[PDB]
């Protein structure tokens, strides 16, 4: 198990997905045209996980870029690292999806999906041992949300034994394109609960607050939020992209993180938060990554309990000190980790730090406090749905009110299920 196939869908999907390929291409010594001008052999040892080798020792991202309009994807080709992506993997429609889940899932996107699956199958075939798929998308618009979840469903049909990962950007009124976002998100969460093994919940609420409160950006752009997203994505893929004892794969992650199959919504965290000169001591990384202020999902982990945790330290540091500090927070806050999964915190260290920082920590948590996120979206949803507001946009593409009711019910069930283990 090595090769992953990456798909990015919609405005958000392709914006954050572009930053991901920018960040990791720098980490693996690949340049804006595709050539390797590195220095360490550790950079190329598992370059195969995310890149294909090409004619002339070029490395080509195993990346499929999907949108229902060409706006965002002409920007990706324009932008700093655009010329690296394989041009056949740009698969785009013309009319877009108007922030409408139904258009993504049932009408506009249905027209386009079979072409995306031909590129998926192309990349899937020239793979020694495919472990799975990761998708970047938001849940709030129509393409990345509705079409994205349509893809997932199709990929599962054709490759029912491979892993499915999402980086799924959850919406907030604090960073809001349209009033129908809670609808779109609730329709997609219903899909994600059934058809993914792992989902990283990137809440835009949490990114806005990190940007505002902790980084002193008064007027935060999507660029400022995506700076935080690509550093988190860099962190939660480190163990796949580098060595050397942890034979870490997506299946192993799924097995150890997910005690119950529907409860696979991970809260990510990063330390230190940036946009420095003083490197952080291991105690500080350990305090910071576990801090609510450093979570990429707007949930207080003190309101819930940690089912499982996976922590990843980057830089040159004492592993003695890393165990000591990781054991200190467990022993000093033991009520917040479930007694009925012994040794639920697993920690790893990797010598290569990220660009900029001498040392950093990335956190992956399956906390029951994630319910707060689904409760927040369940509330915004009901505010509108109890008066059937804005529904005509969805019923005009053939959807029924019963489908909204179903979806509202699955999410509220998810919330009940997370609440069940907080009290056990």
């Amino acid at each position: 198990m090595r090769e992953i196939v990456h798909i990015q869908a919609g405005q958000c999907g392709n914006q954050i997905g572009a930053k991901f390929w920018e960040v990791i291409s720098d980490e693996h010594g690949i340049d804006p045209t595709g050539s390797y001008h590195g220095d360490s052999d550790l950079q190329l040892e598992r370059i195969n996980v995310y890149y294909n080798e090409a004619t002339g020792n070029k490395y080509v991202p195993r990346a499929i870029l999907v949108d229902l309009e060409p706006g965002t994807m002409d920007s990706v080709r324009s932008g700093p690292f655009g010329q690296i992506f394989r041009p056949d993997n740009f698969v785009f429609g013309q009319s877009g999806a108007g922030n409408n889940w139904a258009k993504g899932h049932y009408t506009e996107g249905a027209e386009l999906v079979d072409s995306v699956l031909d590129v998926v199958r192309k990349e899937s075939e020239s793979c020694d041992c495919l472990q799975g798929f990761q998708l970047t998308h938001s849940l709030g618009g129509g393409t990345g949300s509705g079409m994205g979840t349509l893809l997932i469903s199709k990929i599962r049909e054709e490759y029912p034994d491979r892993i499915m990962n999402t980086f799924s950007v959850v919406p907030s009124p604090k960073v809001s394109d349209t009033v129908v976002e809670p609808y779109n998100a609730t329709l997609s969460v219903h899909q994600l609960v059934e058809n993914t093994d792992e989902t990283y919940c990137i809440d835009n609420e949490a990114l806005y607050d990190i940007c505002f409160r902790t980084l002193k950006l008064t007027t935060p752009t999507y660029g400022d939020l995506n700076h935080l997203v690509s550093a988190t994505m860099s962190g939660v893929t480190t163990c796949l992209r580098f060595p050397g004892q942890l034979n870490a794969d997506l299946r192993k992650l799924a097995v150890n993180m997910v005690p119950f199959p529907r409860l696979h919504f991970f809260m990510p965290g990063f330390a230190p938060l940036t946009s420095q000169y003083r490197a952080l001591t291991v105690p500080e990384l350990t305090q910071q990554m576990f801090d609510s202020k450093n979570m990429m999902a707007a949930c207080d982990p003190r309101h819930g309990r940690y089912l499982t945790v996976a922590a990843v330290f980057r830089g040159r540091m004492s592993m003695k000190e890393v165990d000591e500090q990781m054991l200190n927070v467990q022993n000093k806050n033991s009520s917040y980790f479930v007694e009925w999964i012994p040794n639920n915190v697993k920690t790893a260290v990797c010598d290569i730090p990220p660009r900029g920082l001498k040392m950093s920590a990335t956190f992956i948590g399956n906390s029951t406090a994630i319910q707060e996120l689904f409760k927040r979206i369940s509330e915004q949803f009901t505010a509108m749905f109890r008066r059937k507001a804005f529904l005509h946009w969805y019923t005009g593409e053939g959807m029924d009110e019963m489908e909204f009711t179903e979806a509202e019910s699955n999410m509220n069930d998810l919330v009940s299920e997370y609440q069940q283990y907080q009290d056990a």
């Binding site: 009408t107 249905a110 593409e397 053939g398």
Partner: protein
């Protein structure tokens, strides 16, 4: 899920067609009711005027046949 996905797009087409249909039929309905009404108004106007011509024939045949 795939059969449901086909029911939803079939419904979207069905209802769009239905709107186009009933607008087409509602319109033809009105234009035909209107033309019958307008023609009925003008037919009555002309039939009241032709009833005067025929009363003027009675007055012209009361001067000629009273001498």
């Amino acid at each position: 899920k795939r059969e449901h996905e086909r029911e939803v797009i079939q419904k979207a087409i069905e209802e769009n067609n239905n709107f186009i249909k009933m607008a087409k039929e509602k319109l033809a309905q009105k234009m035909e009711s209107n033309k019958e009404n307008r023609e009925a108004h003008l037919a009555a106007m002309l039939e009241r005027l032709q009833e005067k011509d025929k009363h003027a024939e009675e007055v012209r045949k009361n001067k000629e046949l009273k001498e």
